[PDB]
Amino acid sequence: HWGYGKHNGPEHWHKDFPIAKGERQSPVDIDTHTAKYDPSLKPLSVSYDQATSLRILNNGHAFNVEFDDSQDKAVLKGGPLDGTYRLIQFHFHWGSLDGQGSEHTVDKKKYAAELHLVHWNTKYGDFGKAVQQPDGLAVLGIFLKVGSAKPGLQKVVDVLDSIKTKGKSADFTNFDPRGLLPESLDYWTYPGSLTTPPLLECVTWIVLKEPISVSSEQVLKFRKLNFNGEGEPEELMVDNWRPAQPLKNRQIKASF
Template structure:
């Protein structure tokens, strides 16, 4: 789609750029915040400025998903998503991106089934993006980048007492990945874009309650899954990735 940008996505890029500021690592142990890799930036992203606490292993993410190498598993269950909109708490600017965070003290917002042995609680979601539409997603499909990628981060509260412990251990996290592509107007995404100007400054937190992130997940049940890692330090291989095959569409109003 030469010369075409999604208006909503372009606005998202513009707002996100105002959030990135060189800063120390966030206070939280692992925010999993949006992060573009060093070879896609002129400056080194703050999460990569200090030595890695855990070296890369054999299950590092992201990966290039190849359709021809995908293996159908008839024993995989459907993924069941049950989010309570009232568990949405706030949007937080951590100095280089934003997180939409949820109350994870109970099992009100969970996913279960699919490749997961236990139910996992929703902790937060964030986006990965690029400076242009030609790339932005972390995962690729047949070496193709999407303009952006949404990550909904969940943790195994059955096996671990806290999110911080789950980050460091096997089967601790489950992340749903959703690709964004150019297409129809997306009201759910627009709601987020409209809120971003209020968190221009580092450590700004605003209330963002009664939001159902289900609206950001395609209804098509098909997904890829694999055992991988965080894509930002500490790069722990604690993530069960669930990558939705169908992307969501964002506004196709055109401008050069």
């Protein structure tokens, strides 16, 4: 099945999921000189105060921190979004080296990693129905570079030991995703897709301009995770990012 290697990676995905070559695929390169300030964009509202994390899971591609999305606790609204989007989970994409790892790029620049905070449009009742809608999801994207430690990330780092291999999960309650944010909420936005199979074209992407910095030791711990299950040959979980896809006449709008 699908992964990120030579034989099952981004270049093969289209065979099982023809939408891979679709009209609004993600990620994309953000050409900063072609992006335009949009005065019609409302203030962005990230409201994570009452967020209820549940567990962390190595799903064989990355690790997911999942949240209780059974009420309006952690929600995204404003910016390009109409209505209320509920936080369901977050995950990262990272590289084998610091000069690669992000999915979106900024004037072709690749960051060390990218954090995706995944939200679903509450007018659709559940996540599963949302992903049948052109405006079903909103993903907040945050670039990571290597510098000083991100204190709000350490609790995630410290648990990766426990979820090394595919299928492993750990309790991960009382984690506050507010500690993963940069100070500015300046962003670019464009309509796009899930960056993994089934590559559904259901996402409003909101990609923050300001990266967070994480330490070299924090990134190294991401890179110790495994793509394989327990008792199988070791395949380090690195380079689990899809490259930039054709913009196809979409417009990337800037909030700033």
